[PDB]
């Protein structure tokens, strides 16, 4: 182990004894006096101080943000809407632990590190799709909806949220307001909407708007009913995206840890880094005053930015130690003061 020793070199040049300063108060006294014998008396060997127990942080408050993840009627898959968010903190902690969220899959960012980095802009994409194509929403694969309604780029970043709507979209009479396309001449580019509902033209025949035979209407209707089982239920899917390195950072979530008292801890009250014990005090600040000083410019009190409470700060216990020994002549017992 790494410690401090006092080696005794003889006239011959070979060490013949040693003492370990970390064993006993007597050994500490021997090291302090740099000798192997101590006479009767009281000696001040060192000084002790209680170590800090933990750390706390106190920062200001946050944004509220609810509306996009719970609305009345979500937009269709072929007419998905987008939202713009700026100059407000993104508290994703409330959504990470929420109960009825079923799907959380992404690749660009870590599932738990999304709040440790700061972004610039936030884009929210909201639509409703059947539960069969939840796997299909990932970029890379093709087919229905993924190529005809909503396509994602290969370098897409961000995490999407999907949840069931068993008791919020099912109707006994039947709902058909949710539409999707199965016939498109070209391929949809990533992050592109298709709103035109022109009838499909198949090679030939004069159905170029006549809407007759050998031509089908591309926008078909969904089949959304309590008699349906797993696989046909409508799933609400929201897609979050962002861009970086094109503007100053504006949107990102907040530490603001819990407050503890009556023990020497490390505190950070909007700065003012230090270590000490926190106790309630009767001192009365002015509204604009944050912290107070005693004689000789010593931090006596501080105001918690969260609850505006008045806290008295004093250093935790410290002091010197003294070892009472009757001398190595008689015995080796010691007492500590």
């Amino acid at each position, epitope marked *: 182990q790494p410690r401090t020793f006092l080696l005794k070199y003889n006239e011959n040049g070979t060490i013949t004894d040693a003492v370990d300063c970390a064993l006993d108060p007597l050994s500490e006294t021997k090291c302090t006096l740099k000798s192997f014998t101590v006479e009767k008396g009281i000696y001040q060997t060192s000084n002790f101080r209680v170590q800090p127990t933990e750390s706390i942080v106190r920062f200001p408050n946050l944004c509220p943000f609810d509306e996009v993840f719970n609305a009345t009627r979500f937009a269709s898959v072929y007419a998905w809407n987008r939202k713009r968010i700026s100059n407000c903190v993104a508290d994703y902690s409330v959504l990470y632990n929420l109960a009825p969220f079923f799907t959380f899959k992404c690749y660009g960012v870590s599932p738990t590190k999304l709040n440790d980095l700061c972004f610039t802009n936030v884009y929210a994409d909201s639509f409703v799709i059947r539960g069969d194509e939840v796997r299909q929403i990932a970029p890379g694969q093709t087919g229905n909806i993924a190529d005809y309604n909503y396509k994602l780029p290969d370098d897409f970043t961000g995490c999407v949220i999907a949840w069931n709507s068993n008791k919020l979209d099912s109707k006994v009479s039947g709902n058909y307001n949710y*539409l999707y396309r199965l016939f498109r001449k070209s391929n949809l580019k990533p992050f592109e*909407r298709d709103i*035109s509902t022109e009838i499909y033209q198949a090679g030939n025949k004069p159905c170029n708007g006549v809407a007759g035979f050998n031509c089908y209407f591309p926008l078909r209707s969904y089949s959304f009913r309590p008699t349906y089982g797993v696989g046909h239920q409508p799933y609400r899917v929201v897609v979050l995206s962002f861009e970086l390195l094109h503007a100053p950072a504006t949107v990102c979530g907040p530490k603001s840890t819990n407050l503890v008292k009556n023990k020497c801890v490390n505190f950070n009250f909007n700065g003012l880094k230090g270590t000490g014990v926190l106790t309630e005090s009767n001192k009365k600040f002015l509204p604009f005053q944050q912290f107070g000083r005693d004689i000789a410019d010593t931090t006596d009190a501080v105001r918690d930015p969260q609850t505006l409470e008045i806290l008295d700060i004093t250093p935790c216990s410290f002091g010197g130690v003294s070892v009472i020994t009757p001398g190595t002549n008689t015995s080796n017992q010691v007492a500590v003061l």
Partner: antibody
Amino acid sequence: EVQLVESGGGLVKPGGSLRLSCAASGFSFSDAWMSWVRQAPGKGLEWVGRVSSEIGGGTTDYAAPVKGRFTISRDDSKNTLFLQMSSLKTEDTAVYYCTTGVDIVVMMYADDAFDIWGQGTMVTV
Amino acid sequence: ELTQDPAVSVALGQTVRITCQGDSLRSYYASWYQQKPGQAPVLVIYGKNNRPSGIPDRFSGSSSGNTASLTITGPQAEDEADYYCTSRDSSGNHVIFGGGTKLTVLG
């Protein structure tokens, strides 16, 4: 798919009221974003306002020079747009176009791209 | 408030550059529209660098900080029209439009 037709407009005394009708068909009308644009004769295009869609909240915006004095609305049942004008001025002599913001574009921005336009109508005050 | 030159004089077979100056062009990338004389404006250049379907591969757009540029390769006699740049402001989120520019043919 797409045809946009403009109705209304003409000669009217200052301070009167006039309503412009724009009808669109062939594309889906509740779930798209419209906008209004004007252009003085011999000058550039000038913004008028926006109506947006009810899927996401009504956030009908207006241009700064004509804020408050113009009324906009959307009626998805009859697929018609009504634009009501009040407290007309001598500088309102221009042509008005009803423009669909997005038909086929990569948006990645606010829902405003001005893909397809209309023929426009002439109004004089 | 976007600023554009009044008119551009480029001969046939030469690259035509159309500029649009604005303070907030770092974000809200500008969109370019072409308005024929006595005709409704049409979309030519939008998004990052692409164009709507049906537009011939002759117009390309680029941006650098607070400057937006339009490039024309192999100009014909039917391109004589007005070009407008449209951007967005951060606060009001308005289209504001631009002052436009005039392009002619030196044939």
